[PDB]
């Protein structure tokens, strides 16, 4: 799931000690063409009873249920993707009345209602990169929480890490070999990892990339 490539990319950037450079030129590592197609804009952990609900930046919503099934509702509020335990996938609509999914659809709508009522949309002011017209939406593969962060792994290979204390977030893509950093002031910047290696970066980003490698190691080992 591209995790191995992610780990190697992070190992390489971190080994270069990017914050120990004197004349840091972080802006030279920016590549707005590498902005992600998707990131997680909201989430709610109700895994003690139902599962983990989330919103993607395109306003689609999803749930990773406790039975290890996944349901996605598109931003049109009708189109569905349903992914079974084995990875089997169906493309359906709510309006067609899929009898056997109506319960799970209802649960997803309750997740959707809670998120709309209560939660802020991360990166709301940023236009995501356009994907291929015939590309399916990714699902949440896995997630875990530490004392300091939530780690979210999408089926397109992206790894997202949200830090609780200061609301800073990383979105890592192994296909672009890029990192998006959303800072304490909500500033959204996308960098090529190889260019961070060459040009350097601030202590704040470097520290978070070190933590990211530890998290990616955990994702890799828990497979």
């Amino acid at each position: 799931c591209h995790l191995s490539d992610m780990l190697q990319q992070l190992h390489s950037v971190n080994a270069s000690k990017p914050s120990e450079r004197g004349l840091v030129r972080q802006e030279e590592a920016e590549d707005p063409a590498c902005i992600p197609i998707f990131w997680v804009s909201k989430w709610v952990d109700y895994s003690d009873k139902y599962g983990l609900g989330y919103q993607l930046c395109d306003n689609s919503v999803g749930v990773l249920f406790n039975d290890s099934t996944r349901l996605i509702l598109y931003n049109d509020g009708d189109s569905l993707q349903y992914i079974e335990r084995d990875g089997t996938e169906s493309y359906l609509t709510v309006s067609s009345h899929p009898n056997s999914l109506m319960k799970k659809i209802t649960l997803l709508k309750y997740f959707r209602n809670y998120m709309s009522e209560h939660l802020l949309k991360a990166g709301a002011n940023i236009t995501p990169r356009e994907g291929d017209e015939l590309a399916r939406l990714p699902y949440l593969r896995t997630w875990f929480r530490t004392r300091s962060a939530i780690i979210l792994h999408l089926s397109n290979g992206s790894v997202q890490i949200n830090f609780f204390q200061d609301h800073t977030k990383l979105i890592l893509c192994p296909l672009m070999a890029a990192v998006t950093y959303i800072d304490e002031k909500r500033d959204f910047r996308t960098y090529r990892l190889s260019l961070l290696e060459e040009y350097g970066c601030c202590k704040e980003l470097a520290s978070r990339l070190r933590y990211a490698r530890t998290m990616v190691d955990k994702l890799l080992s828990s497979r």
């Binding site: 997680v40 909201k42 989430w43 709610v44 952990d45 109700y46 209560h118 939660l119 802020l120 991360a122 929480r145 530490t146 004392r147 939530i150 949200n162 609780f164 609301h167």
Partner: peptide, 7 residues
């Protein structure tokens, strides 16, 4: 840890 994203 928290049970939801930023409210």
């Amino acid at each position: 840890p928290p049970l939801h994203s930023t409210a």
